[PDB]
């Protein structure tokens, strides 16, 4: 049958507006900026933004719009030999659909802890804390082996952090039930219902941004926030000599745009043909980058206040890892009037952003995997069993990283499984196939037929030159100057855990050469005939 189309021009805007404006902006860009020194992260961030990420965002939206198929089968008319890029995207989003939702579990664990009249991270006289904990207000009053209540609540109550990935500890029942609650919300809000329609247009679209503006106003007026903004903006140029900044910023663009996932292609698949995706895509990419930049201003003003209050330097005041949004932002919540109310509203904001940017990516995965097998998964009894099986398998695989040694597995997934050199591999192969095996001229002619105009010399030369050169250069540079993944600057990962992370990255990567080999083996003839048959669009 006819698949679906957007029953507005605003359903696409609302779908991608909550699609790639999520925790990659308010949670991930903070610690990836903080981990790489603040100012030095913004140069490759904007290089990959205006050279790669917005062109690949437009690229996948058009590959959805032209080939009205999602993720995998969209390459059936875009050189089917590289159909595995679609498969690669699904592996990426599958791994993303595990680890991303674990964040929301932590947010939900912070949401249930926010209903107390006295916040548990606002003071340390609890059971979970060390005796070395002092209040942040008192660290300039006593005589440097001292720790903050927010970091102690994050590490020994939420995470319950163990000695390493070698010691997973016991499964946290609190966090496992929070993770189960968040998948129950997700599974009840994909297509087990119908569609969130009435409430998504105003509360969803504005209240995360309103709470981000409230957090920005709180952060910028905190004492000592100027040093935090100086950390955030002013670069260390020699830090650009390390490949970590380039790989972190490039795959943070590709993560934050959800753009090697088969999801923006899936949301472009529901676009009408003659629909101007270019202007909407650039306004929404501007929204995404501005949300990241403004939320970074907020959180780094808060970190500058924390460094002012504790006396420790800005680069050491919080976690150089995935808990920076769960350390700095709750600390700013305790600096607001009536902190309980802002705690509930802030973690409702994080939950809303994460659930939107999980409904959208799970929709992309489902859309691609049912365009891959139509009439095996119809619109009825089968795409409830399939949704439940996918959500249950993703929840069970997310139980491995929500345990007591679960931050180490989470940092492994976040560095490797869906936001690393796998993203560079898939983005390079997308831009390479469009540019040279399909043609920027042929694809630009396809673009004009429905958008109305030729893409300029920026998009054409970004798909042609800029994005393959940036992806190849950062992929090569992260391997010829390879430093291993470390969690919070002090935990050295073992060889087997780095191998497991490279296994996740390679399971994402190797869907392209495996599909190339499979389709080269299932077509009869000599090699120059098989390749020519498999690069002709169908």
């Amino acid at each position: 049958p006819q698949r679906e189309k957007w029953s507005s021009k605003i359903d696409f805007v609302l779908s991608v507006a909550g699609g790639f404006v999520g925790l990659g902006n308010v949670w991930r860009f903070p610690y990836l900026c903080y981990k790489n020194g603040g100012g030095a992260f913004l140069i490759p961030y904007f290089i990959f933004l205006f050279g790669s990420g917005l062109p690949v965002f437009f690229l996948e939206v058009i590959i959805g719009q032209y080939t009205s198929e999602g993720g995998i089968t969209c390459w059936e008319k875009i050189c089917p030999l590289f159909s595995g890029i679609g498969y690669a995207s699904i592996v990426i989003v599958s791994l993303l659909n595990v680890y991303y939702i674990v964040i929301l579990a932590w947010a939900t664990y912070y949401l249930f802890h926010s209903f107390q009249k006295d916040l548990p991270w606002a003071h340390c006289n609890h059971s979970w804390n060390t005796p070395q904990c002092m209040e942040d207000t008192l660290r300039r009053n006593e005589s440097a082996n001292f720790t903050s209540p927010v970091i102690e609540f994050w590490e020994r109550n939420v995470l319950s952090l163990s000695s390493g990935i070698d010691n997973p500890g016991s499964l946290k029942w609190d966090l496992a039930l929070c993770l189960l609650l968040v998948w129950l919300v997700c599974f009840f809000c994909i297509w087990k219902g119908v569609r969130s329609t009435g409430k998504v247009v105003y509360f969803t679209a504005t209240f995360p941004f309103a709470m981000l503006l409230v957090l920005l106003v709180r952060g910028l007026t905190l004492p000592g926030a100027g040093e935090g903004i100086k950390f955030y903006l002013y670069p260390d140029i020699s830090r650009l000599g390390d490949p970590q900044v380039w790989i972190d910023a490039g795959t943070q663009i590709f993560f934050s745009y959800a753009i090697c996932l088969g999801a923006m292609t899936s949301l472009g698949s529901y676009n009408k043909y003659k629909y101007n995706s270019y202007r909407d895509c650039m306004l929404l990419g501007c929204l995404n980058s501005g949300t990241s930049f403004v939320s970074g201003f907020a959180i780094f003003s808060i970190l500058g206040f924390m460094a002012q209050e504790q006396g420790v330097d800005i680069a050491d005041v919080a976690e150089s890892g995935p808990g920076l949004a769960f350390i700095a932002y709750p600390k700013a919540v305790t600096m607001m009037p009536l902190p309980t109310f802002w705690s509930i509203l802030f973690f409702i904001m994080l939950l809303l952003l994460g659930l939107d940017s999980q409904f959208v990516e799970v929709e992309g995965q489902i859309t691609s995997l049912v365009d891959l097998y139509p009439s095996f998964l119809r619109k009825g009894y089968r795409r409830e069993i399939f949704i439940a099986i996918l959500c249950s398998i993703s929840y069970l695989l997310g139980l491995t990283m929500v345990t007591e040694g679960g931050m180490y597995v989470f940092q492994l997934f976040d560095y490797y499984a869906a936001s690393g050199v796998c993203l560079l591999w898939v983005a390079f192969f997308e831009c390479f196939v469009i540019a040279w095996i399909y043609g920027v001229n042929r694809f630009s002619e396809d673009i004009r037929d429905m958008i109305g105009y030729r893409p300029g010399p920026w998009m054409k030369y970004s798909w042609a030159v800029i994005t393959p050169a940036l992806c190849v250069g950062c992929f090569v540079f992260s391997l010829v100057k390879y430093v291993p993944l470390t969690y919070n600057k002090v935990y050295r990962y073992p060889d087997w855990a780095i191998g497991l992370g490279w296994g996740l990255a390679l399971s994402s990567m190797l869907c392209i050469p495996l599909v190339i080999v499979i389709l080269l083996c299932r077509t009869e003839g000599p090699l120059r005939v098989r390749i020519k048959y498999l690069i002709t669009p169908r």
Partner: antibody, heavy 118, light 108 residues
């Protein structure tokens, strides 16, 4: 200086055939979609046939949807409109119009060929 | 076809007098795709207004356009002697592309 010069317009019999020729110069012809727009002796403008930049998206109006064929020569920069079974109400002044951006319109027209059917 | 019915062709204005000409569409034109062409007597049409508001190359600022969806309009604040021509509105979105009728701006 974008210049489109049309040629090959004369007198043909009813039910006959003719091949027009929009020779284009002054621009990269492979990157701009083209159209043939005819104008009636009552001086009304009717769009006849659009070809895309590489020639893969070809559109016709409902009058000429089965008897007109528009083609390009991007190597030599000539737009062609091969006609067949020309009826009486196809006598017109044929312009080739450069329309590539759909929001910019036909920003560069050519001269005319006076196709007469008698 | 998306038949564009424009204002009646013969309209006569003294020079320097503000004039409007309207253009209705049977379907809805997206208002970024409707253009206005000026064709003089014995000459080819040329682009005059694109996306129903902008001005082409060499079009004076006295020419303006407005409208949305179905009703669109071209307006001249002051008519000099070089406006004696025919003006065609044209949707250029729906793939059976249609021009409007004549609007012959003659003088007194």
């Amino acid at each position: 200086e974008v210049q489109l010069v049309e040629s090959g317009g004369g007198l043909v019999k009813p039910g006959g055939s003719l091949k027009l020729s929009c020779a284009a110069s002054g621009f990269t012809f492979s990157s701009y979609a083209m159209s043939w727009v005819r104008q009636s002796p009552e001086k009304r403008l009717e769009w006849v046939a659009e070809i895309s930049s590489g020639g893969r998206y070809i559109y016709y109006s409902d009058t000429v949807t089965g008897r007109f064929t528009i083609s390009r020569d991007n190597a030599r920069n000539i737009l062609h409109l091969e006609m067949s079974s020309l009826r009486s109400e196809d006598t017109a002044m044929y312009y080739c119009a450069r329309g590539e951006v759909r929001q910019r319109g036909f920003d560069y027209w050519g001269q005319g060929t006076t196709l007469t059917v008698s | 076809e998306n038949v564009l019915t424009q204002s009646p062709a013969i309209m006569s204005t003294s020079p320097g007098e503000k004039v409007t000409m309207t253009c209705r569409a049977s379907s809805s034109v997206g208002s970024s795709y409707l253009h206005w062409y000026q064709q003089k007597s014995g000459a080819s049409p040329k682009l005059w207004i694109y996306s129903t508001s902008n001005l082409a190359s060499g079009v004076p600022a006295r020419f303006s356009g407005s409208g949305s969806g179905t009703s669109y309009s071209l307006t001249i604040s002051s008519v000099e002697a070089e406006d004696a021509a025919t003006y065609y509105c044209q949707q250029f979105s729906g793939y059976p592309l249609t021009f409007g009728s004549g609007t012959k701006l003659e003088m007194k």
